[PDB]
Design a protein around this ligand. Structure first.
Ligand SMILES: C[C@H](CCC(=O)NCCC[N+](C)(C)C[C@H](O)CS(=O)(=O)O)[C@H]1CC[C@H]2[C@@H]3[C@H](O)C[C@@H]4C[C@H](O)CC[C@]4(C)[C@H]3C[C@H](O)[C@]12C
Ligand SMILES: C[C@H](CCC(=O)NCCC[N+](C)(C)C[C@H](O)CS(=O)(=O)O)[C@H]1CC[C@H]2[C@@H]3[C@H](O)C[C@@H]4C[C@H](O)CC[C@]4(C)[C@H]3C[C@H](O)[C@]12C
Ligand SMILES: [Zn+2]
Lengths: 49, 49, 471, 50, 84
């Protein structure tokens, strides 16, 4: 509730920007965990890091 | 800030310079906690509602 | 040329540009390398008896209503299949009964008829995992009996590795190690009782595996060689086709997912493809990898482009609506109405109303709005979970009023009513609960509560309580 | 809340099913309503005034 | 109450000290029944309940159960300003 996704009236949501930045960090994080699970080539895990 | 308002200022030269003419409507809007307490204190209104 | 740039895209483009593409015969060479690795690891698995034991146990599990056959084995290179299982049982038990000699060759023939047996990815990978874990448990006793002696006993690796390797199980390197009369001779005695039980668990592992130490080590070392070579080949080919991935990933440029997210999830799909490229069929690689790379990029964009994620099937439905609406707009002249999409699609026309109602991207709460000293939208979204202080004041006032009222009743009735309703206590008790606490049946407490309520209705009383109803 | 179940039971009232969300003239303002207009979405039954 | 503000670097162990649970997935809400979708950035399990004194699975809905983490969906029924 300091980075809210409050729905402004009209069915439209009105998110913050930190939801975007965290969502991106966590996506790239989860993807890097996968790229280390598949035992990937080096250049791909370097790109992901 | 709560308890605050603004409107256009004007002259009013009858005033002593320890007072400012302040409109009835703004004053009744700003002073509603005080009015509610006063009314239920003098008993003119049973409950706060 | 290393620095001078803070872009990650360039730092990826350069590193992928250093590597050069592949020739068709080049790709065939890499594929043959991968087959070599996989066949080497399958042979290394074949020289392991428990590699057969696990499959036998699993088939029984599928026989015993514990899995599926199709998802216990990936067919064979089901009556033919099952007679092959029984033949596996027969050759397994005969090689086990021939422990005396030719059993080298019998294990060879057993594992070679097993090589015609095709497994599930879980099956073979878990066999490899079990062999890895067994080698790890062997290396456990290894690192113990090595660290107990060269690190704790001050034994040279010259006179340790020379004899520690070669038997590893008996005492000829153990009682005769001290029988060499060395400075580490009298120093092994403190741990020789522990090293002996370390060899005890090592002997247990040898009993468990059905093979020695050195032969098992040759097997799984060849196995690890083959796997590392396969990984080397797959690294080679994927580094070849990173360019293909950038080519296919250009086109999804601005559908909400950053560019390197697209090229990275394309690469993950590409690894998926290289794990399944089949050159025997003889089609050029790019033709086959393109399906996987587009599937990966699109599954990605559907799964992680919205802030409020919507499932894959729903995004496919929305793309269908938008594409048919684009057609209807180029055709009907104007923009089609949400009932005509019902006729051009196959929708109840309320499913399309819901699908259109699925909200678009949330307006970033820092949208600039004019105006009045540069205020963003976030300044305008009030708080709704709050309760306005007049209702808080009036809750307090009603609390005080009901207290002063219930004081007017009798003490027992006031308590039965403070307990029947949740007034001034943590929970609101059942009438039977209050009865058991007061030692009376429910009907009596019901009449008591009704008596109190009826008395509270009584005008000359409850004037203020009536005043707490605003309508 | 407690004391509200008490009040409601005492005065035999059934709590409302639906919430007031009317449109009301903003505070202070007078006027004479010179025109009303109702926009009914396609597929919703037009009331009397529409 | 207090009399000075200290500022220093936050450690891994401290950062796990403030926190109530890892945020594993990026989902925010469920787009159809707008629930905090566990366990993403607005996780009812991790950051608290959405309405005061009500679990998320609806099982517990009263101040009789203040403090009880549900069994079904694990949302500590507490004031929703703990969400903050
Ligand atoms: C002051 C500004 C005009 C400046 C020129 C106008 C233009 C857009 C208006 C807002 C939008 O409707 C979104 C939002 C809807 C909520 O439900 C009610 C509040 C919000 C913030 C509105 C209040 C205000 O009226 C706004 C800021
Ligand atoms: C960028 C633009 C600045 C003003 C020029 C901002 C200020 C407030 C925004 C609107 C509000 O959300 C209200 C409304 C909600 C609907 O349901 C969805 C769209 C609407 C029309 C929004 C579009 C646009 O984003 C507006 C006009
Ligand atoms: Zn729950």
């Amino acid at each position: 509730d300091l980075r809210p996704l409050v729905p402004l009236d009209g069915g439209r949501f009105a998110t913050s920007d930190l939801n975007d930045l965290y969502r991106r960090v966590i996506n790239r994080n989860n993807r890097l965990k996968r790229l280390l699970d598949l035992a990937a080539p080096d250049i791909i895990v370097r790109n992901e890091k | 800030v709560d308890y605050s308002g603004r409107s256009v200022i004007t002259v009013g030269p009858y005033l002593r310079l320890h007072q400012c003419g302040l409109p009835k409507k703004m004053a009744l809007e700003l002073f509603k906690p005080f009015i509610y307490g006063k009314l239920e204190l003098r008993g003119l209104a049973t409950t706060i509602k | 040329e290393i620095g001078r740039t803070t872009d990650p895209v360039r730092m990826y483009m350069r590193e992928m540009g250093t590597v050069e593409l592949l020739t068709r015969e080049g790709e065939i060479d890499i594929a043959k390398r991968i087959e070599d690795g996989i066949n080497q690891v399958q042979c290394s698995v074949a020289e392991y008896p428990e590699a057969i034991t696990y499959l036998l146990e699993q088939y029984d599990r599928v026989e015993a209503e514990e899995a599926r056959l199709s998802d216990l084995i990936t067919g064979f290179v089901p009556e033919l299949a099952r007679e092959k299982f029984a033949e596996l049982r027969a050759q397994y038990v005969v090689t086990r009964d021939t422990i005396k000699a030719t059993a080298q060759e019998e294990i060879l023939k057993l594992s070679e008829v097993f090589k015609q047996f095709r497994l599930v990815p879980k099956q073979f990978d878990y066999l490899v995992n079990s062999m890895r874990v067994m080698m790890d448990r062997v290396r456990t006793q290894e690192r113990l009996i090595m660290k107990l002696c060269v690190e704790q006993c001050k034994m040279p690796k010259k006179n340790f590795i020379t004899l520690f390797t070669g038997n590893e199980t008996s005492d000829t390197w153990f009682n005769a190690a001290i029988a060499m009369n060395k400075p580490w001779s009298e120093k092994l005695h403190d741990v020789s009782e522990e090293v002996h039980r370390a060899l005890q668990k090592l002997q247990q592992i040898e009993e468990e595996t059905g093979l020695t130490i050195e032969q098992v080590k040759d097997i799984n070392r060849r196995m690890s060689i083959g796997e590392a070579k396969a990984r080397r080949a797959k690294k080679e080919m994927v580094e070849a086709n990173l360019r293909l991935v950038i080519s296919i990933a250009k086109k999804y440029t601005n559908r909400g997912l950053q560019f390197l997210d697209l090229i990275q999830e394309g690469n993950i799909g590409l690894m998926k493809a290289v794990d399944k490229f089949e050159y025997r069929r003889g089609y050029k690689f790019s033709t086959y990898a393109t399906w996987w790379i587009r599937q990966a990029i699109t599954r990605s964009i559907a799964d992680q482009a919205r802030t409020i994620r919507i499932p894959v099937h729903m995004i496919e439905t929305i793309n269908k609506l938008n594409r048919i609406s684009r057609q209807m707009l180029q055709e009907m002249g104007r923009e089609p109405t949400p009932e005509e999409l019902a006729e051009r699609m196959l929708m109840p026309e309320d499913k399309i109303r819901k699908v259109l109602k699925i909200a678009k991207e949330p307006i970033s709460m820092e949208t600039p709005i004019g105006d009045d000293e540069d205020s963003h939208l976030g300044d305008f979204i009030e708080d709704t979970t709050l309760e306005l202080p007049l209702d808080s004041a009036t809750t307090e006032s009603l609390r005080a009023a009901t207290h002063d009222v219930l004081a007017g009743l009798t003490a027992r009735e006031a308590k039965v009513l403070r307990m029947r309703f949740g007034i001034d206590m943590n929970t609101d008790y059942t009438l039977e609960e209050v009865g058991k606490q007061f030692d009376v049946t429910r009907e009596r407490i019901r009449q008591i509560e009704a008596k109190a309520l009826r008395k509270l209705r009584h005008p000359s009383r409850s004037e203020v309580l009536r005043s707490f109803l605003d309508d | 809340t407690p004391e509200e179940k008490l009040l409601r039971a005492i005065f035999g009232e059934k709590a409302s099913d639906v919430k007031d969300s009317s449109l009301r003239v903003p505070n202070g303002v007078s006027g004479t309503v010179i025109d009303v207009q109702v926009f009914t979405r396609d597929g919703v039954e037009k009331d009397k005034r529409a | 109450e207090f009399d000075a503000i200290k500022i220093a670097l936050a450690s891994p162990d401290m950062i796990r000290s403030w926190s109530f649970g890892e945020v594993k997935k990026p989902e925010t809400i469920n787009y159809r029944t707008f629930k905090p979708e566990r366990d993403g950035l607005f996780c009812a399990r991790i950051f608290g309940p959405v309405k005061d004194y009500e679990c998320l699975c609806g099982k517990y809905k009263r101040l009789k159960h203040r403090g009880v983490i549900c069994e079904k969906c694990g949302v500590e029924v507490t004031q929703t300003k703990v969400r903050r």
